[PDB]
């Protein structure tokens, strides 16, 4: 029974991942074939770049603005920078914008989406000049809607680029997010790659490879069938007609970009993900903040599940993959929970050692593929993501399920999960307190657990050596620290 369950877990985890790898590779081949036909110095889609932010680091906001300005795309109509706030502290963003761009900061007294006349011409007069708006703080959706209306008042603008206030774009990110829109009349959105640059912490180092996997594999797989989720945010291109069609139902809903993407998909429109457009953002360095962020992400995903399933019904035989993935995530969560619960109350050393060895092996295979794809030996740190998942995501999923003092609603379930895991480990240790070197099964269990501990210790020591030698830092991170030292 235990062997059958472990084999089922192994196949269930390593078969969908292999299928996703194959689909992402085929999406990469399709996009490469599309790009190989792109004429040199191609600029046919007029683009307005939208930056929506709220009290970002003055250094990182300046880096984002400079990365936008230092972009090689030849057809950029305008830059729209919307700031969720007109308070005294929110003027720092305007000052940074004036440092990097013109003195066209506007402070309307109203939020554009909460007015009888929502046209961008009510708060703007010239579409040629880059614009900065200081609008009252309502949310990411309201600032994004103001940016959409400011971009839509120029009839010559064909597409729109959404980036975060902290995204350091590559010199060809805009070109590679806007090119796929012209390769298919039914493609109304493109998702770009987001890369974590601040790999100076054990959590951020693993979150960087989690982002790499979840973008490359898990979005090329969706883009093969052209049903990518969560487009926009750090980097994403939207056609102007589709946003003109879907902005009102999206803003009048009773910012995660999930509902915007589902509004695109519910109308039968294709969405691709390009791995050749890269924008650099950061990740939380704190475990607890990561826990609350993942709780919010899981709450958003669980809220937009019926709408996602309905969206993956408008595609005749496509969208079956989207529905299968939506069911697979739930089935995987409950499979992991059931496996841990079963092997935790039985206190069988053979089963626990087999489970940890199989999980380590499958994560080693996944990390090997990640290293091959990224050409980076640091992708083997992803074997340590098992701890991050088991100790931050499962509490996050349970909290999202249960919440849909302020400390209790955020961390009580996490602390209870930690206490339960500790109690299960202690019970398994005290229920199997014996030594028998004459038994081959006990020898196998002890040697397996000791080898697993030695492996994880060696990986941790390698990470520590890299941290001391600053070998874990991305080149952009080294550049950013060097720039910060002297401002």
């Amino acid at each position, epitope marked *: 029974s235990a062997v059958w369950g472990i084999s089922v877990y192994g196949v269930f985890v390593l078969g969908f991942y292999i299928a996703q790898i194959v689909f992402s590779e085929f999406n990469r081949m399709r996009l490469s074939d599309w790009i190989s036909l792109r004429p040199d110095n191609w600029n046919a889609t007029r683009v307005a770049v939208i930056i929506a932010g709220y009290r970002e680091d003055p250094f990182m906001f300046k880096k984002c603005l400079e990365s936008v300005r230092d972009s090689e795309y030849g057809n950029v109509a305008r830059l729209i920078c919307v700031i969720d706030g007109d308070e005294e502290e929110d003027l720092k963003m305007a000052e940074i914008y004036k440092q990097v761009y013109n003195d066209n900061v506007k402070k309307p007294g109203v939020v554009l989406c909460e007015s009888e006349n929502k046209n961008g011409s009510t708060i703007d007069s010239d579409v040629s000049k880059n614009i900065c708006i200081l609008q009252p703080h309502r949310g990411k959706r309201e600032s994004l809607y103001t940016g959409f209306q400011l971009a839509s008042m120029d009839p010559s603008v064909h597409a729109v680029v959404l980036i975060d206030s902290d995204t350091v774009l590559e010199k060809n990110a805009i070109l590679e997010v806007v090119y796929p829109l012209s390769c298919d009349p039914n493609i109304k959105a493109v998702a770009g790659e987001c890369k974590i640059w601040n790999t100076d912490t054990i959590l951020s180092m693993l979150v960087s490879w989690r982002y790499f996997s979840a973008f490359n594999v898990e979005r090329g797989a969706q883009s093969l069938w052209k049903t990518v989720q969560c487009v926009g945010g750090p980097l994403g291109a939207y056609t102007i007609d589709i946003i003109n069609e879907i902005k009102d139902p999206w803003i009048t809903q009773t910012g995660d970009n999930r509902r915007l993407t589902n509004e695109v998909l519910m109308r039968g429109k294709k969405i691709v993900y390009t791995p050749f457009a890269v924008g650099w953002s950061d990740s939380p360095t704190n475990v607890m903040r990561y826990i609350v962020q993942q709780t919010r992400w899981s709450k958003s995903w669980c809220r937009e599940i019926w709408y996602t399933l309905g969206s993956a019904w408008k595609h005749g035989f496509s969208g079956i993959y989207l529905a299968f993935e939506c069911m697979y995530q739930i089935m995987y969560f409950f499979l992991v929970m059931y496996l841990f619960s079963y092997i935790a109350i039985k206190a069988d*050393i*053979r089963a626990q050692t087999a489970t940890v060895l199989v999980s380590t092996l499958v994560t080693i295979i996944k990390s090997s593929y990640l290293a091959l794809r990224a050409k980076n030996l640091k992708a083997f740190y992803f074997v340590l993501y098992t701890y991050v998942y088991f100790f931050c995501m499962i509490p996050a999923r349970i909290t999202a399920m249960f919440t849909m003092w302020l400390w209790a609603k955020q961390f009580l379930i996490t602390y209870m999960w930690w206490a339960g895991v500790l109690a299960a480990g202690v019970y398994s240790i005290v*229920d*199997n*307190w*014996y*030594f*028998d*070197w*004459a*038994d*081959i*099964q*006990y020898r196998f*269990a002890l040697v397996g657990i000791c080898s697993y501990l030695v492996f994880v210790s060696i990986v941790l020591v390698i990470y520590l050596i890299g941290k001391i030698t600053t070998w874990n830092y991305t080149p952009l991170q080294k550049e950013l620290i060097e720039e910060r030292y002297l401002h």
Partner: nanobody
Amino acid sequence: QVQLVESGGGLVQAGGSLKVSCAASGRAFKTYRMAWFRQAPGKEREFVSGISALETTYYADSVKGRFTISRDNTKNTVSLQMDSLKPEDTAVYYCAARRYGGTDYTTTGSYDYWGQGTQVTVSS
């Protein structure tokens, strides 16, 4: 520590069967490797059979295909089923238990908790 009390025995004619049971009155029986030893009237103790904490059956020579050892952990017992007796199998059968031990499961000194012994005899 486990206190081992043994049952079974009696007389068998030839080519028959028997069962010897050993109940342990300790605390954590499922962690104890158990063993059955025989002592001939004019010889020393010999390892006959054994079962590990994770069930793994060991049998000696002239015993592999005839005996069968099992353990119950709900009722803390270890049982040896001698399904084919020969006149050489007339010996006192003891049960031994251990929790911590090395590679040697055969020597009398490998097990620290011992039973009293049930006389098992077969007459021609």
